[PDB]
Amino acid sequence: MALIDQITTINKNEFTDDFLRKYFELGFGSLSKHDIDLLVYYLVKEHSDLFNGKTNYEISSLLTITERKLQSIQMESYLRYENNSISKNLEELSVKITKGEIKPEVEGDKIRVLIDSPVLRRDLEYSITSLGHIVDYSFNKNILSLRLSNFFEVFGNLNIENGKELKTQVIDFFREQNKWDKEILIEIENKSWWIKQFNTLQAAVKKEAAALIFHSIISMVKSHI
Amino acid sequence: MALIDQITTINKNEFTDDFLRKYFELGFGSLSKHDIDLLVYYLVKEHSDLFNGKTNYEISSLLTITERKLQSIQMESYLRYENNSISKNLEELSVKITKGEIKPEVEGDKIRVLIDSPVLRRDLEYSITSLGHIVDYSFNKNILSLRLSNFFEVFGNLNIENGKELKTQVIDFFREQNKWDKEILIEIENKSWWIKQFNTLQAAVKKEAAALIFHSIISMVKSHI
């Protein structure tokens, strides 16, 4: 079975102990098939490394189910059997960016972020839309697209975790890169600035700018509940 | 949970390994609730001592299910996941009699045997009714009642495992006990013999006679496929 030996490590004692406690909570035969499928997904995720570092495409292939079914299973099981703060999920998103597992990229006046985890996607969307203002964004499958000019105009004044204003931290990045790149004016609330001036920069400056921008946006959202 | 700590020993490694192999045989989410309930029953029975030495009443109480449901689950799970010969099940029945876990008792012209296991009950009934003749017997719940006079008249000539005829082995028992009990004629194919003469014996002779008779009947049935 390509499945059970793809498991390279698993705490079999607590897989068994946990399964028995939850299968038998209301008595033998009390859980529905769907309840048990959520339990099994949780048990493999909590007590093995099977899903570790794998994309949704890989996990769905491993489980022999569609990506759409996997997303429902992942969310329903997380809600049933796990508890995380929005703060911890936002921080996990941030760390994935620092590690390069998620690579934000700017195109025109939009920053785009592939977020494969439905749990992280849910908490980001909820938290970023709970700041008192409608947010200019959309999702293309699992890719968040966020309008830059409008975001900084509307939310640029809110503090990030290190106390500085969001717009301040992003502007300060562009100044430093002006030290080794050809100098540009900095107008982050300007749609045409992103479209023409930002587009001029070297692909590696733009890559790094997008990671810092999204790090700072997450940091701003974490600072505000 | 009165359940999971009633487990005094369990191979948790193979409980986990076995569950994963069978849960995932056709892919995640392919097994019905009923399929999974049969699997779990088999897994607890194969990989723990939870059910060991317990009556159906105790197991059903442990599982929070009726005795009728338990019997269906036990049979369906055995058929799905286990394999035993009729010969091995008949021998297990025999050993339970020697151990005193099952105590055959004669009343009138009938010998009665409580058989709690639906698996053993099924193989006994099938094997004992596959000897070419209709058998005079009935079940009261899990108590087999077998008519003595008619059984020895019809099947008394068939060999038991040690080569002797069934009627011969049973008669030889009554002779030995005549050595220390008051002597009786021996007419095991006679209904009124069981009802009046056998009834005379001491309760401990009758207890031992019933175990030897049923041991020999099982031995006869094992000798004939």
Residue numbers in the entry:
A (entry chain A), B (entry chain A): 1 to 225
From the paper:
When ectopically expressed in mammalian cells, SidN is transported by Importin-13 into the nucleus, where it attaches to Lamin-B2 and interferes with structural integrity of the nuclear envelope architecture, leading to nuclear membrane disruption and eventually cell death.
In order to obtain clues about its function, we determined the crystal structure of SidN at 2.1 Å resolution by using the single-wavelength anomalous diffraction method. The SidN molecule forms a nearly cylindrical shape with a length of ∼60 Å and a diameter of ∼35 Å. The architecture folds into two domains. The smaller N-terminal paw-like domain (SidN1–82) is exclusively α-helical and formed by four helices (α1–α4). The larger C-terminal domain (SidN83–227) is composed of six α-helices (α5–α10), one 310 helix (η1), and a four-stranded anti-parallel β-sheet spatially arranged in the order β1/β2/β4/β3 from left to right when facing the sheet. Three anti-parallel helices (α5, α10, and α8) are packed against the β-sheet and the rest helices (α6, α7, α9, and η1). The two domains are connected by a very short loop. The C-terminal domain contacts the paw-like domain via the N-terminus of α6, as well as the loop between β2 and α6. However, the surface of SidN has a hydrophobic concave region lined with conserved residues on the end of the paw-like domain, suggesting that this region may serve as a binding hub. A single-amino acid change of phenylalanine (Phe19) or mutation of both phenylalanine (Phe19) and valine (Val40) in the center of the region to charged polar residues significantly decreased the punctate distribution of SidN at the ER and nuclear envelope, indicating that this conserved hydrophobic patch in the paw-like domain of SidN is essential for subcellular localization.
